[PDB]
Design a protein around this nucleic acid. Structure first.
Ligand SMILES: Nc1ccn([C@@H]2O[C@H](COP(=O)(O)OP(=O)(O)OP(=O)(O)O)[C@@H](O)[C@H]2O)c(=O)n1
Ligand SMILES: [Ca+2]
Ligand SMILES: [Ca+2]
Length: 427
DNA sequence: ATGATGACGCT
DNA sequence: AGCGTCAT
């Protein structure tokens, strides 16, 4: 009892932009606002591939990875915006720059960990302590939490249900105990309301957020009420929430490990994991995974919010599917040059912006027939931000993968090329 | 024939 | 070093 850690030591939020690329294109082109629309890449094959879908279009069944021609069968009025194409490949600069807008606003409030182009974790523990010292111990008005859901509460319209739950939560809150984890989460949610208001005011972009005691629960919380809402998942809410929560919904369990937990243990839901000892879970899934699962199914996780806003690698890739697979030496060399030129542009901007230089170039390829992301990776020194040198060096390190006897031909044909600059040093 | 990109674990 | 897993 008195010696059992409860994983209530931190306040962590996860902020996730709603249909991010669609919002970027809707900000730029007001004719797309409040419409079923989608963002596509490429255009000639089946109208292009859908990468992002507005909530109006999702109501028709339009999803990511669908071909736009097929999405138009579900939603004939679907509007489309296309990703910029430069040197024959998709160019995502517009969305990376919009991402920086949002991340810089979030960084004013707290240390953030960039998790993807449109997600960041926030460690709010210190900011909460400060706010509890200020204006205390005054009660927290529901007006400070206008878009917050309390998971598990209450207990015929959506907003009435939201407010009934918020009222039940605020009425039970012990506002005189500055160390109450539930109070700390509530103040965390107040700050996240302020952060999300600042993002929307200064960029036009809406987002969702989760607030809890660790990254996994904050990520789970964020998805419970999308879009344009935030959700607080308390430690006390975990047993009911996990009791019907498919294992695959928890971050890192969406793949082979999660499938093996289900198959080996014969369970379906996250809460069912509590019945196993730590040693049992370590025996099936390894020491690290087993300890992690034992704590996580109790709502406890210690992965820190890392202080990192910049990517550790900068990379450029293109797939060559089907009959387009690269099959001549001139083809491989020309596309390596195209990738190297885009990479040079990104690296030179990175060096000016962030005072650092990459020192290693990783070349990844996939060969036709291979189901893996990469069939082969090789690396060489990155000593100059020069596209011709980078592309020549990349060819040098993959040259002898070519099994073809004819010198102008490449066998087996290449279905992906990927150049990645890594091992940054201060500059 | 989604495709573009990124973090991190294992050996 | 080079491959495997999981993710947005
Ligand atoms: N299979 C995937 C999933 C996502 N992404 C990248 O991750 C971004 C954001 O992904 P996600 O948050 O899943 O989708 P949103 O469009 O933001 O929709 P939501 O409102 O559900 O968050 C996408 O724009 C895309 O750049 C991707 O490349 N490939
Ligand atoms: Ca998103
Ligand atoms: Ca996301």
């Amino acid at each position: 009892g008195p010696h059992m850690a409860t994983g209530q030591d931190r306040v962590v939020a996860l902020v996730d932009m709603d249909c991010f690329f669609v919002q970027v294109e809707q900000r730029q082109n007001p004719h797309l606002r409040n419409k079923p629309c989608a963002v596509v890449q490429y255009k000639s094959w089946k109208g292009g591939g859908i990468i992002a879908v507005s909530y109006e279009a999702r109501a028709f069944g339009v999803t990511r990875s669908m071909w736009a021609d097929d999405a138009k069968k579900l939603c004939p009025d679907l509007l489309l915006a296309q990703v910029r194409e430069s040197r024959g490949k998709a160019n995502l600069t517009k969305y990376r720059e919009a991402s920086v807008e949002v991340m810089e606003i979030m960084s004013r409030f707290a240390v953030i960990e960039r998790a993807s182009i449109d997600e960041a974790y926030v460690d709010l523990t210190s900011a909460v302590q400060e706010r509890l010292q200020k204006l205390q111990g005054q009660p927290i008005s529901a007006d400070l939490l206008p878009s917050t859901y309390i998971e598990g509460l209450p207990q015929v319209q959506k907003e009435g249900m939201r407010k009934q739950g918020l009222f039940q939560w605020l009425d039970s809150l012990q506002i005189d105990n500055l160390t109450s984890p539930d109070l700390q989460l509530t103040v965390g949610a107040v700050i996240v309301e302020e952060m999300r208001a600042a993002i929307e005011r200064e960029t036009g972009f809406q987002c969702s957020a989760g607030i809890s005691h660790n990254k996994v629960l904050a990520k789970l919380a964020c998805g419970l009420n999308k879009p344009n809402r935030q959700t607080l998942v308390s430690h006390g809410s975990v047993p009911q929430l996990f009791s019907q929560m498919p294992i695959r919904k928890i971050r890192s369990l969406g793949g082979k490990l999660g499938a093996s937990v289900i198959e080996i243990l014969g369970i379906e839901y996250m809460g069912e994991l509590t019945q196993f000892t730590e040693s049992q879970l370590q025996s099936h899934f390894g020491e690290k995974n087993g300890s992690w699962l034992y704590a996580m199914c109790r709502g406890i996780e210690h992965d820190p919010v890392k202080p990192r806003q910049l990517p550790k690698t900068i990379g450029c890739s293109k797939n060559f599917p089907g009959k387009t697979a690269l099959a001549t030496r001139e083809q491989v060399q020309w596309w390596l040059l195209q990738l190297a030129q885009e990479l040079e542009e990104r690296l030179t901007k990175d060096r000016n912006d962030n005072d650092r230089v990459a020192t290693q170039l990783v070349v990844s390829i996939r060969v036709q027939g291979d189901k893996r992301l990469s069939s082969l990776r090789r690396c060489c020194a990155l000593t100059r931000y020069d596209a011709h040198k980078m592309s020549h060096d990349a060819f040098t390190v993959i040259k002898n993968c070519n099994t073809s006897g004819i010198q102008t031909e490449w066998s087996p044909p290449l279905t992906m090329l990927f150049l990645c600059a890594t091992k940054f040093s201060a500059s």
